[PDB]
Design a protein around this nucleic acid. Structure first.
Lengths: 58, 102, 159, 245, 201
RNA sequence: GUCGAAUUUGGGUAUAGGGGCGAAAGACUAAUCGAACCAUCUAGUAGCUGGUUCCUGCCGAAGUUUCCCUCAGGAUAGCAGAAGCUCGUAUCAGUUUUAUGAGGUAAAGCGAAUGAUUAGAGGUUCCGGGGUCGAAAUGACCUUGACCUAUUCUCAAACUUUAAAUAUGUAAGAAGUCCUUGUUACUUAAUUGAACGUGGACAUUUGAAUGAAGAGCUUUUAGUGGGCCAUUUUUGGUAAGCAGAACUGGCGAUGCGGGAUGAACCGAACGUAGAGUUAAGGUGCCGGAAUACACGCUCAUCAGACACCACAAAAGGUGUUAG
RNA sequence: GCCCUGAAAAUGGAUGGCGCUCAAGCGUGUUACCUAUACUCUACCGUCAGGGUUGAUAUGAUGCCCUGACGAGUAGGCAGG
RNA sequence: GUGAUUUCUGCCCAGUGCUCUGAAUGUCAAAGUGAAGAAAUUCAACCAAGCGCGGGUAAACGGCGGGAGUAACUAUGACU
RNA sequence: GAAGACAUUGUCAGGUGGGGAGUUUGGCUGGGGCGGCACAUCUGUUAAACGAUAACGCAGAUGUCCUAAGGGGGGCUCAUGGAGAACAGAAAUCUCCAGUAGAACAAAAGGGUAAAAGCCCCCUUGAUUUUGAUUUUCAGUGUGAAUACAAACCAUGAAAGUGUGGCCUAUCGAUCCUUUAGUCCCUCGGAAUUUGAGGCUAGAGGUGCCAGAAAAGUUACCACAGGGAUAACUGGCUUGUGGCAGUCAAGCGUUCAUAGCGACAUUGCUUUUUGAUUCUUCGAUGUCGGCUCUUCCUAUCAUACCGAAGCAGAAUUCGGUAA
RNA sequence: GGUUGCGGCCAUAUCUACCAGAAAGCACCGUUUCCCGUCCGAUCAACUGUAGUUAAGCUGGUAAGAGCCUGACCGAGUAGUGUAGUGGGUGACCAUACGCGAAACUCAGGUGCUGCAAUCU
């Protein structure tokens, strides 16, 4: 009782019902995977410029 | 294969934390040592009628064990384990290799 | 049995070139990659370390990470009804800039100059591109030019 | 008809030998063709009755186990002889001629109360094992083998060069100058610092000084059989000498 | 042996003898050049071809049987030294038979396309009517539909009948033994004087 | 067949279910026997067959991925409905153009590499093997062979310098550009770079075309996981209404006009009606509609009549017609 | 090119049948005509979407009313009865 | 087990079974004995039958072949 | 009278035990069995120039080997051909010129490599510790393998630098149980000490049917749920093969191609052989052969009339209309 | 413009064969105490620019050169190929319609360009 093993027929029409849509983007992408030497400095750079605008400009 | 008896690798023993000289010996299993937990359970369950109650493995297919080394530091005597690949012939020590021979 | 190794079916795709074997030239290493640069992937066959999988021959991504010998590249890849966001780590021999992005930067600088100069004069900025238009009417001259009559040829074999 | 011959060993030694002896008595008279395989070779015999002549030749010279099946082709209606196409599946015992073989416990206590750690000597119709330390032999018919098949621990490829220094005989001999204590040392550790092994062997008569013998060097191998694990480790010899040259 | 109706159309990929094949039957056709095969190009001017018109496979033995029948007509009429036949088609494609699933090698075949020349005969001008009837009796042996075209070229040389004469009239043609070497302007000037002394004069 | 005996037979009595009895058949044991009958545990279990009850409205599938002692079955992703939430020109697209990448198939190539292959020619011998002059030569002189130089015929899924078409990657600006100059433990010989900023500049042609019965996000859940056909590309096979794949369309789930007839072809997708015009096919008659018009061909003592499609070949004709 | 020979199968039979011979055959060109649940326009039902409406309609704002597109369907889902 | 009578019932104790007025220590359970430990325990010695070795056994189950060489040549129901 | 602290009976412990009880006896598959592994994997091709892709498609590989064949630096050039040198020749050692890889790189094949990734020397342990991010098969889970960093400690080199096993593509494994290393930490719950036991973090002992059960046969005495998803018979498609008919002509026919024959090739028909395939039937189409009886076909053995012959007659052979 | 050091693209720069090279620069060249390295001061190290040369190296020029390189109403809108037909043909395959479009061959030209720092009748 042999059976049909593999086919890709009707598999493209199924994908194009709900759409092949993008992840479509974000501002401020996540820092997972970035060089950890860079992330360790980039923490202190934002903390200083938040303290800079806090005391000076009000 | 062949590994030397003296190997210099990293130590982690709260005083060294650096590369010190190790000794190399081969790993041996150890005794079965009943009064362990799974043995006292299995000694209870076999008793009675019903015969064998646990599966016994038969269909064995490997032919080699992995080689495990235990590295004892010479200063602080803190041992450490380190594994190798599968090989049929494992001796350590003799026959340092020479290429140009008759 | 079937075979699906990490470099299967890559006989011709990772060949070097004809008369371009050997070590790579030094302008590959001196080029400078900042975060966000549009890069194309073309896998060099000589340098085995840091090498993209056979899918990524020809695709195009964005640089998000810069490290010692390598960059990080994000690629959109489809599976099923969905685009995933897949990150790679390629050594710099395998990577190169896309000039289509760099020619866009050259077109922006012209668009700032056309706006600023025509603001001083004060009319008709006209900044967009246009597709090719159907051509105008024009009068063609037969002066010194007689139309040469043609005819279909008969059949000859010459085998 | 087809006599499918198979052996489950990668290094064929007995399988080479059967090709030489099938030609000496010349049993291949009725072969239509000869095909080979991964682990054996196949034969084709124009009638059914030519194949049963061949299995009775294989039964005398080599340990086999056979069984049969058939299939329909024609299904003739009138006579009844529906012209089936038979097949004979022959399997050889996978022990070669000089393997190191660790016997199971129940089988070792049945024959001769022999120690479990033996060699092989006579690869013929019955398989003959031989204890090299103390000479004692025992035979193994294929009916006793296939009811609980085991494997060979080593093969004829794990052999190491050995160089004999002298022959110190004890004197007791079966028929081949048995139980000679032999001082032997490997070719590798000869030029480098002095490592000497001292072992009994059945090779007492044909062995002299300055000669090269081949043997199994157990002391550096990590085997993974459960029969070898179920021994007493401090009774296992370090070297088992096999043959000369 | 199967009839050639089974093996008539080019279906499978080209399957030649190589180190992956290792076993073929021997070719039926061996000899390709017939007649006076040591004859200069200035001797036999007129060339006659046999051009196929259907995309098919010719077997190796249909090439053999037609090669004999075209030979034994032409030698008995005009002598065995008045023509030069050259089989333009070599068989390399190996055909597979399933002798009772992969096929064993069975025989060799050719891969004949539309417009492809099968036979070629170069003769004298007076010995024209013998050749056309000679290839006519070789046409019944092949399958399909073939036609004969008289060649406008001088023999086997890829130059026309008037074009060959004007280059031969200058010292531009020398005979290598069966074929003509030609003068080229591009190249060294000294070695074109070792060859071709009649030119530059 | 046998008929005075191992004979036939009544009544009494013994042997009971994994037990009996057997001059041996797995026979017999109340029409039940390769393990009886009756009741209960019992409504035993089933991935396997059969059935599954009222109407209308709206949306509407799957035979494919991975894993399983898995292949007549499930889990999982997919397709599907339902309930919606946040918002309302957002920015998206089974598409093209402009720019720019990537590939090694079709073809092509062998006086280009590797690997096959035809024919002679020109050469070369302290150096393949045979004759001759030869006491011999590392001599002269023929032949047969090897090599070598320039040519010649023909090839390749696992050969290639070159190399399409069709397909496919990204870019075509607000999160963008430019000037001023803050932050840090990174970086630099160096306030040099880096990354993120402050503040100012630059708007409706704010950066190609066309479309947008809205765009984005989530929760939950049914059925399905036996598929098949056609054109083109293809593998095994001599071939098959055969087996196995690729892209799209289709039947399954779907009628209607046409092919007389048909799941799949050609037209065309459907609420109930009236009028009009057509598609595919048709107009001697059955049959709605020109026994219309126009130029020729064919006469068959087997004519011929319409795609898929229900068949015909090599080869011959002073039958006839045009070259 | 058409036509004939090549061209042999078993119930009686199939250009669909009748029949057709300057065709009702083959090649080909021009117009006319026949008709589908398809297309155009209007009425009717329903579903969906965008809307108007505090005056009452002694009522139904789960209503009344306006404008526009759409309608095939097994397995299955929901809704009004 | 074989199946009246007459007539015969050949060779083989290796395998598998069966069996014994056969040798002694290879294997060898519980209980018991000795040592170490504070004790649970651990370790060693001792160690019945049976197995193993040796002998008998075919009107017990069963089995009954091949290969060479012998004063050229020749190779047996000879011989080795 | 015999027997006697033995037997006997009671409890635990070895041996024996188809006399008996209970269960099991893989999967894929051109029916099922035998084989094979397409059951985990790798290279080249099929594969139709991104990726993805099947069959019991083709040509082959793997269950290893290695303290150097791992890591770093320095020197140097190989295959092969040509010309030379006592013994020395086709092959030893020595030298020179040409030498784009035609060599070598542990192994299958395909990439890659020339002041190296090859050959020869010098020094070594990065084949090490702590856990994360990513790629491939993919459900974007596991396992295997790999890439790029960070924090440590080191190797090598003058230094730049490279090194987290083998130049890259394969070489391998869950819970439970046992075991070892690590902090020498946590717990044994009336309270302590010492033994023992249980935990945490990281390894090994293995499942090859490779996402992982502990597993022999037979049924011709057979049983049940089912399957035309699947065999044995008819029909259907197919025509290798079997049967039959053409063309073309080398030659036979004592001297001549076709009276009669027909090598080497080549086009067809037929469904009375036999294969192939699995479409129809397994809630049954009664499955050989003969006997009996009717009808049909022509590819004609006889009978009717004819044509040709190497047809004198006779006898025969070839062909036509003809069932 | 010549040369040197350091490069970029990596033959228009290489390969075979001859010829020419002022000035400076390179280079050949001269020694063996030291440092170091070899069977061998040849390669490598060190010392002298002194004793000697442009002979080779090196750059440049010639060749109806070999190779390479851009081209072209050169071959060719050919081979191929996407889409469409109730188009042809018994089939094999071929025509037309709307589009895209090679390679060989043939001929014509070409034989390195340039960056930073230095130094030269």
């Amino acid at each position: 009782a042999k059976s049909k093993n593999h086919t890709a027929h009707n598999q493209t029409r199924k994908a194009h019902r709900n759409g092949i849509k993008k992840p479509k983007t974000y501002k401020y992408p996540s820092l997972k995977g970035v060089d950890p030497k860079f992330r360790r400095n980039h923490k202190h750079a934002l903390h200083g410029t938040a303290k800079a605008l806090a005391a000076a400009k009000k | 294969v062949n590994v030397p008896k003296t190997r210099k690798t990293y130590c982690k023993g709260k005083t060294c934390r650096k590369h010190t000289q190790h000794k190399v010996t081969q790993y041996k299993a150890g005794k079965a040592s009943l009064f362990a937990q799974g043995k006292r359970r299995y000694d209870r369950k076999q008793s009675g009628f019903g015969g064998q109650t646990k599966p016994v493995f038969h269909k064995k297919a490997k032919t080699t064990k992995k080689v495990v080394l235990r590295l004892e530091c010479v200063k602080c005597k803190t041992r450490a384990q380190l594994t190798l690949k599968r090989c049929k012939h494992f001796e350590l020590g003799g026959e340092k290799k020479q290429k140009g021979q008759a | 049995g079937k075979s699906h190794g990490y470099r299967s079916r890559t006989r011709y795709m990772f060949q070097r070139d004809f008369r371009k074997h050997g070590a790579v030239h030094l302008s590959t290493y001196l080029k400078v990659y900042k975060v966000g640069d549009i890069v194309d992937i073309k896998a060099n066959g000589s340098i085995q370390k840091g090498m993209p999988h056979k899918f990524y021959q020809g695709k195009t991504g964005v640089v998000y990470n810069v490290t010692k010998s390598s960059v990080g590249v994000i690629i959109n890849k489809m599976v099923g009804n969905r685009y995933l966001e897949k990150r790679l780590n390629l050594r710099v021999e395998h990577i190169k800039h896309s000039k289509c992005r760099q020619e866009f930067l050259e077109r922006v600088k012209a668009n700032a100059a056309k706006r600023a100069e025509a603001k001083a004069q004060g009319v008709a900025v006209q900044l967009k591109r246009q597709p090719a238009q159907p051509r105008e009417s024009r009068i063609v001259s037969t002066e010194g030019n007689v139309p040469q009559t043609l005819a279909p040829v008969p059949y000859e074999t010459f085998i | 008809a087809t006599v499918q011959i198979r052996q489950k060993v990668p290094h064929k030694r007995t399988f080479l030998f059967l090709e030489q002896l099938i030609l000496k008595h010349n049993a291949h008279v009725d072969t239509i063709s000869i095909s080979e395989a991964k682990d054996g070779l196949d034969f084709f015999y124009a009638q059914k009755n030519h194949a049963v002549k061949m299995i009775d030749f294989l039964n005398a010279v080599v340990p086999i186990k056979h069984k049969k099946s058939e299939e329909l082709i024609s299904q003739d209606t009138h006579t009844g002889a529906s012209t089936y196409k038979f097949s004979y599946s022959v399997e050889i015992v996978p022990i070669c001629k000089d393997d190191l073989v660790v016997l199971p416990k129940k089988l070792a206590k049945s024959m001769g109360n022999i120690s479990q750690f033996v060699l092989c000597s006579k690869i013929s119709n019955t398989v003959q094992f031989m204890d090299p330390t103390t000479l004692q032999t025992a035979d193994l018919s294929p009916s006793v083998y296939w009811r609980a098949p085991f494997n060979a621990l080593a093969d004829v490829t794990q052999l190491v060069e050995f160089i004999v220094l002298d022959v110190d005989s004890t004197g007791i001999s079966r028929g081949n100058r048995v139980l000679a204590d032999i001082t032997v040392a490997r070719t590798s550790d000869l030029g480098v610092n002095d490592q000497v092994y001292y072992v009994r062997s059945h090779l007492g008569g044909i062995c002299h000084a300055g000669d090269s013998v081949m043997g199994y060097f157990i002391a550096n191998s990590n085997y993974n059989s459960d029969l070898f694990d179920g021994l007493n480790i401090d009774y296992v010899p370090d070297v088992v000498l096999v043959k000369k040259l | 042996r199967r009839p050639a109706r089974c093996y008539r159309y080019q279906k499978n990929k080209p399957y030649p003898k190589s180190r992956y094949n290792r076993a073929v039957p021997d070719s039926k056709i061996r000899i390709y050049d017939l007649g006076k095969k040591k004859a200069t190009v200035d001797e036999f001017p007129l060339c006659v071809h046999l051009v196929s018109n259907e995309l098919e496979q010719l077997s190796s033995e249909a090439l053999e049987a037609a090669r004999i029948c075209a030979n034994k007509y032409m030698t008995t009429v005009s002598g065995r030294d008045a023509f030069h036949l050259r089989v333009r088609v070599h068989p390399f494609h190996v055909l597979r038979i399933n002798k009772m699933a992969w096929g064993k090698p069975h025989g060799l075949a050719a891969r004949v396309d539309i417009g492809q020349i099968i036979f070629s005969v170069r003769t004298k001008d007076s010995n024209k009517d013998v050749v056309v009837e000679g290839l006519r009796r070789a046409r019944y042996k092949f399958p399909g539909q073939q036609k004969i075209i008289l060649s406008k070229k001088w023999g086997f040389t890829n130059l026309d009948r008037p074009e060959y004469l004007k280059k031969r009239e200058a010292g531009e043609v020398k005979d290598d033994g069966a074929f003509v070497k030609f003068l080229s302007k591009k190249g060294s000037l000294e070695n074109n004087i070792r060859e071709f002394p009649e030119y530059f004069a």
